[PDB]
Amino acid sequence: EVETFAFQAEIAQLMSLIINTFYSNKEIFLRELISNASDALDKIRYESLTDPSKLDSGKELKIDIIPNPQERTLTLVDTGIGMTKADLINNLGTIAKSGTKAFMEALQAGADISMIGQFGVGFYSAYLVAEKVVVITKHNDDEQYAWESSAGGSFTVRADHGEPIGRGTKVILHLKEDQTEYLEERRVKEVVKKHSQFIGYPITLYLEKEKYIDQEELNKTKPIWTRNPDDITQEEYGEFYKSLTNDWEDHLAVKHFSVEGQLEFRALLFIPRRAPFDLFENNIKLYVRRVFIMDSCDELIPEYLNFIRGVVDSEDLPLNISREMLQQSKILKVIRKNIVKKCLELFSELAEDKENYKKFYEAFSKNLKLGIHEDSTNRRRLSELLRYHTSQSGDEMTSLSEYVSRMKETQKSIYYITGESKEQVANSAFVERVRKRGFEVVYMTEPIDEYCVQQLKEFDGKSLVSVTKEGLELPEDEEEKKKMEESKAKFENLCKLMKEILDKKVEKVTISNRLVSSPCCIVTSTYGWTANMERIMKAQALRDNSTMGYMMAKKHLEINPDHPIVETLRQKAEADKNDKAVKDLVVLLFETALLSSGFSLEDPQTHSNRIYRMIKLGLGI
Amino acid sequence: EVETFAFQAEIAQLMSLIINTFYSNKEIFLRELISNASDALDKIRYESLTDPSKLDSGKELKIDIIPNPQERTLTLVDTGIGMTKADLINNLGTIAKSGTKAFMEALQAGADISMIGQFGVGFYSAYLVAEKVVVITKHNDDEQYAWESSAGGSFTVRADHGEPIGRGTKVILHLKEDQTEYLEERRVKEVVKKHSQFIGYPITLYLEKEREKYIDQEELNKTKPIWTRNPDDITQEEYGEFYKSLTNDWEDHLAVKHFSVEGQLEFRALLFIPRRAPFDLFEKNNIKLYVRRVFIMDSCDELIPEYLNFIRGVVDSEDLPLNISREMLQQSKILKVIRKNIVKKCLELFSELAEDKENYKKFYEAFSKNLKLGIHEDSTNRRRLSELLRYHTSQSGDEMTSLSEYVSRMKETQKSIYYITGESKEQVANSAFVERVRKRGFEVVYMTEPIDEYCVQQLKEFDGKSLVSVTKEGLELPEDEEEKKKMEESKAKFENLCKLMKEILDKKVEKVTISNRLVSSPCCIVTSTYGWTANMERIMKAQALRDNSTMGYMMAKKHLEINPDHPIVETLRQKAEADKNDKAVKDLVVLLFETALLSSGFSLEDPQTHSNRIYRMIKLGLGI
Ligand SMILES: Nc1ncnc2c1ncn2[C@@H]1O[C@H](COP(=O)(O)OP(=O)(O)NP(=O)(O)O)[C@@H](O)[C@H]1O
Numbered sequence A: 001e002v003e004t005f006a007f008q009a010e011i012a013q014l015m016s017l018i019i020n021t022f023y024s025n026k027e028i029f030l031r032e033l034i035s036n037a038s039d040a041l042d043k044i045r046y047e048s049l050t051d052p053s054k055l056d057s058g059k060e061l062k063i064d065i066i067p068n069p070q071e072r073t074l075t076l077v078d079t080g081i082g083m084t085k086a087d088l089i090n091n092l093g094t095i096a097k098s099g100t101k102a103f104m105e106a107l108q109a110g111a112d113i114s115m116i117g118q119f120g121v122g123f124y125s126a127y128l129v130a131e132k133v134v135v136i137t138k139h140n141d142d143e144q145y146a147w148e149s150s151a152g153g154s155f156t157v158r159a160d161h162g163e164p165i166g167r168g169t170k171v172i173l174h175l176k177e178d179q180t181e182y183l184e185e186r187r188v189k190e191v192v193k194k195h196s197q198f199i200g201y202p203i204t205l206y207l208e209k210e211k212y213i214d215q216e217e218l219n220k221t222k223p224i225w226t227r228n229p230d231d232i233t234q235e236e237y238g239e240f241y242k243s244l245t246n247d248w249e250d251h252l253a254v255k256h257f258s259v260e261g262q263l264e265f266r267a268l269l270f271i272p273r274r275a276p277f278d279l280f281e282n283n284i285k286l287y288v289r290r291v292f293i294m295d296s297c298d299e300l301i302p303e304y305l306n307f308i309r310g311v312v313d314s315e316d317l318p319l320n321i322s323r324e325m326l327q328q329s330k331i332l333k334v335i336r337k338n339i340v341k342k343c344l345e346l347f348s349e350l351a352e353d354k355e356n357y358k359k360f361y362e363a364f365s366k367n368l369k370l371g372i373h374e375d376s377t378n379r380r381r382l383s384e385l386l387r388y389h390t391s392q393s394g395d396e397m398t399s400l401s402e403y404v405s406r407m408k409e410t411q412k413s414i415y416y417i418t419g420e421s422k423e424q425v426a427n428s429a430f431v432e433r434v435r436k437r438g439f440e441v442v443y444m445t446e447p448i449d450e451y452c453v454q455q456l457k458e459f460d461g462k463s464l465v466s467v468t469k470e471g472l473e474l475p476e477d478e479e480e481k482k483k484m485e486e487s488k489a490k491f492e493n494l495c496k497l498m499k500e501i502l503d504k505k506v507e508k509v510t511i512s513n514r515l516v517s518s519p520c521c522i523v524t525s526t527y528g529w530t531a532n533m534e535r536i537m538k539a540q541a542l543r544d545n546s547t548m549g550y551m552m553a554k555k556h557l558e559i560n561p562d563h564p565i566v567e568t569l570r571q572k573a574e575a576d577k578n579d580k581a582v583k584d585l586v587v588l589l590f591e592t593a594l595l596s597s598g599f600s601l602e603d604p605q606t607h608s609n610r611i612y613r614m615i616k617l618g619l620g621i
Numbered sequence B: 001e002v003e004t005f006a007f008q009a010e011i012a013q014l015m016s017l018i019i020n021t022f023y024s025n026k027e028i029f030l031r032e033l034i035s036n037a038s039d040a041l042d043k044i045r046y047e048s049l050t051d052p053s054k055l056d057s058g059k060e061l062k063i064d065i066i067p068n069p070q071e072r073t074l075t076l077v078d079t080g081i082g083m084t085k086a087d088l089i090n091n092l093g094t095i096a097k098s099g100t101k102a103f104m105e106a107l108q109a110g111a112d113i114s115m116i117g118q119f120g121v122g123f124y125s126a127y128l129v130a131e132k133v134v135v136i137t138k139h140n141d142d143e144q145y146a147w148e149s150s151a152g153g154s155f156t157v158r159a160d161h162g163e164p165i166g167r168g169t170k171v172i173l174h175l176k177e178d179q180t181e182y183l184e185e186r187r188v189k190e191v192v193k194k195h196s197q198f199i200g201y202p203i204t205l206y207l208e209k210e211r212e213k214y215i216d217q218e219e220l221n222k223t224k225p226i227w228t229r230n231p232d233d234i235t236q237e238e239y240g241e242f243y244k245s246l247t248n249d250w251e252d253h254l255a256v257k258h259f260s261v262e263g264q265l266e267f268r269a270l271l272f273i274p275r276r277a278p279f280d281l282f283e284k285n286n287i288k289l290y291v292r293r294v295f296i297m298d299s300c301d302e303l304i305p306e307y308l309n310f311i312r313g314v315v316d317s318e319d320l321p322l323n324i325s326r327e328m329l330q331q332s333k334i335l336k337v338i339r340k341n342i343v344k345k346c347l348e349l350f351s352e353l354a355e356d357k358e359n360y361k362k363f364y365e366a367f368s369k370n371l372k373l374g375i376h377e378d379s380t381n382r383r384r385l386s387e388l389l390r391y392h393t394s395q396s397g398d399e400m401t402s403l404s405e406y407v408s409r410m411k412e413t414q415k416s417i418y419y420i421t422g423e424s425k426e427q428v429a430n431s432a433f434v435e436r437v438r439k440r441g442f443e444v445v446y447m448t449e450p451i452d453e454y455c456v457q458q459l460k461e462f463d464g465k466s467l468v469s470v471t472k473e474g475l476e477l478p479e480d481e482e483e484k485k486k487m488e489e490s491k492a493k494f495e496n497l498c499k500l501m502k503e504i505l506d507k508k509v510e511k512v513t514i515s516n517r518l519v520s521s522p523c524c525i526v527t528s529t530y531g532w533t534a535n536m537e538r539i540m541k542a543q544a545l546r547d548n549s550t551m552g553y554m555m556a557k558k559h560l561e562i563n564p565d566h567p568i569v570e571t572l573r574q575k576a577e578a579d580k581n582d583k584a585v586k587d588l589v590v591l592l593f594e595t596a597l598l599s600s601g602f603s604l605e606d607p608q609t610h611s612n613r614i615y616r617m618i619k620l621g622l623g624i
């Protein structure tokens, strides 16, 4: 009844699939060949550990690239283990059969090798470019053989009897007409640097330049992340960073770590000394067994840490058939979690070095505050890295932890004020009273600060209070409260008169507890956008205008009872309930308060015209 | 001497390779199986054309998806052509052997068939989820067979004697415990909608529910792909229905561009302009690529420019170099050609829509930001995008006019397009800079949005006429001989006052002089020729991510321009001649400069100083 069968494969169609569909970019053939060559070396090197006599054929392990435009041939020579005739038929001649994996599983216990080859289809990627491939191999055991093929479903193995190759393999690709750009020095150098830059063995490119053969070592920067982090000095770290980033300045700080368990990977991160000019408009590169896999973009690192330049190297990771992406995206999330944790730890330990942390903060404070805006899980740890200019700080910047340390015994919040400049904020009207009482105020004078404090609601159990927002309530004395209530009862009449005069401009006009020298100030409502925040949002190039009015706040006017102007205005308003002079005066006062508070003016020409008219009245016109 | 050989393939490792390495996301197995079913149907339908009697076994072409969580089996049934025992052994058994490809190539002439299958490795993707796959087939010629395997390098073919199927193939996936999420109704619906939405034949999801344990049938591909139809025959109601089904918006499509491109790269595209603007427009699946009515990839800016991402629609192709996983292409030049054609047809669509005045008003009000972003970025398509611009001008009124109309009404002697940028229409219209120009009857373009600065950074001229910012220095209107004589006389007279004001406001204004752009305001602050305009500086001084040092590289060199015909300026000149220095004249000059700085759009370096000066002036005025 039941008739069992066995799976088969269409060799011609399978070869066509490998040639045409597996690999998107045709330049990766080098990446494969060198990889195979690397493995060819690794094997023999391993066999040299317990038997040095196996290296008598050749004492040197190297890789050579020889472009010959005369015959349009790209040659890749390696002094590796080489392949026997049986190895030629079984390994090269069989698709999906890798000799490297078979060698790897035949190792005793846990050895020190880790070879790239896993799938068995890497070699045929050479036919992405070549129209014919000739592999001249010479193993230590049997004689030198030649393997010729053109991906036509058949290949020929022949005794070579050519010039001896010592030990190893020489792969000659007869490039097709279209893909002749790989004979150029520039293309070969670029490809090798992009893909197989960190191969352990020296890769030498031969060329012809009177007329002599010139040799150039394509890879010279040894991958230092493999070495133990404790052994590496700072000079080696700087050299590696400079070679990696083409930067004359060395690194500012370096975090070299390793994660072991079900997911083993070691990473090396660098903080640049300065910030890139272009910046926001390649940061982290993922390596598997020391060969390039993919370039990180929002996967390994968040957007706000895109200034970190580094490498991630893993011995075992699921890989695409094309060896340029991973199979499981969850692994990328795990890598990101570990990298972010180690980066925050690096920043925290860097905060001890005062001058270095000053440089780092001056460079990447915008990134830190962007992370506070975005990374909700790391807000509590990122906030401790914030440095701000305060009233008690002076020229230097102090952290919020220092603020809490110096915070008065009865103070219950951290008072902050935002503006477009440090001078405007320092001389601003809102902080006039608080500084009189001795409470430290935090100046935040960058556009990213508004985004930072949209999310950073509190810190160290102390809430942030905006001085320029309504409902500010400093601790009060009983006498101060009595005076405030009496002044409110006295000035309610002028307040309602001003409210009547300033219709649809100010929702509420009240006396203020935050003014000591300025006559009046315009203060944003509780939930709406602050003046500075409204200025920032109004200037965004790509943002909906029709929605702005939903988030725009309602202005509140606050008058100072002790300022002479307000008292005189109150007396005039009581004496004359309606008058042209008082109306003009209150309109001008509101205009000045609007200008000083931070708000833009709906028609500044009107205010300027009023000033010009009063100037004319001053000098006579 | 020379010993030829033949290539081989290690079958077990090859199968493991297909299962583990080809496909990243495991949900695509349906995408493959459904596709096979589609092909299975196509063939039989073709064989009905020359032989209707061959459909006597079953007259219905359909696809059924039956999840059975009791046995953890996902069944996919199709009434397709079916496979013989020989086809079971060869087509299903042999990897990389596509019987569909053989059927396609054996077709004579060029037939309407365009079957999805091309590689021969699609079926084994079913082992991404299943631990054992059973395929019950019934070809129209031989008896019903059963093909069972577990990807262990061997499969068994058995003469089936269960419930007859009549015709077609029924594949049963015994899902592994980990991948049990595909027995859920929601997951199956989501996968089918994402991948196999536009398969020509109906797809039905049989299920068991209670309303007492009834069987519910639900079709998951009700929407049909209309882009295959000729664009002339389609009506606006059908286009609206397609847009609603594709985008899940109650609003209709604002406009539609449906076009086919033939040749060495043949593809049909269907683009829709949303009536409104998405809330997260600038905060990634607008254009979806299809090959033979199967979803391939989302246009992550490959098919469309970034500024044109507001446009929705589909791109469908028949012949296209496809990846092994069918989730991308092999050549990016194909994507570049696709993008070029899409952009050309989008610009043509916008030009056509510009005729419809009300519809173009809606479209512009929705996507003028995108148009100006394109002008900033897309350099090749600047003439058309510029011609698609509508602006508020001084002579326009409330309604908006194009720059071409501005040039049409442009005076005979005028030789430029005078524009002024600001943060509001009222502020710009009442601004001092345009006081003289409008007095002489020259139309001025109000540019009252932040993106306008980026738009005019690149758009240097239009129709051979150069754009000139009134707020920038060197503004030279066409001037007569007597006007130039008056300007020279004023330059002669106010030289001493200009020198005094330059001395007083040291390191704050580079140059103080007379001007021809003021008729009523005393003074104005004017940006230099090279640096950022005042509005530009205001805009990029408020960007969240900006380089402070770079801010200082392109700062404007402020120029003060006074009005010789303003009474304040003449009185100030008289006083400055009376006293080479005085406190009153210095205070007046500083206050005038501050007012000009405020009106010009420049933010004060310290508003507290100006406010305190005004407060002191008020105190003196009312008496303190
Ligand atoms: N230069 C070489 N020297 C020695 N052995 C080689 C060489 N090139 C290839 N081989 C062997 O031939 C096999 C076939 O090559 P290849 O297709 O690259 O397999 P693979 O590299 O192990 N699989 P992959 O992960 O894609 O690199 C290899 O696995 C090696 O065993």
Ligand SMILES: Nc1ncnc2c1ncn2[C@@H]1O[C@H](COP(=O)(O)OP(=O)(O)NP(=O)(O)O)[C@@H](O)[C@H]1O
Pocket (backbone or CB within 6 Å): B032, B036, B037, B039, B040, B078, B080, B081, B082, B083, B091, B092, B097, B098, B099, B100, B101, B116, B117, B118, B119, B120, B121, B122, B123, B124, B168, B169, B170
């Ligand atoms: N439901 C079915 N009815 C009939 N034939 C089927 C069915 N499912 C699979 N086949 C056959 O299976 C063969 C190979 O399966 P498949 O893995 O889909 O290769 P394919 O058809 O080329 N699809 P693809 O690999 O994506 O190009 C096809 O040529 C069909 O003849």
Ligand SMILES: [Mg+2]
Pocket (backbone or CB within 6 Å): A032, A033, A035, A036, A117, A122, A123
């Ligand atoms: Mg290899």
Ligand SMILES: [Mg+2]
Pocket (backbone or CB within 6 Å): B032, B035, B036, B116, B117, B118, B122, B123
């Ligand atoms: Mg298929």
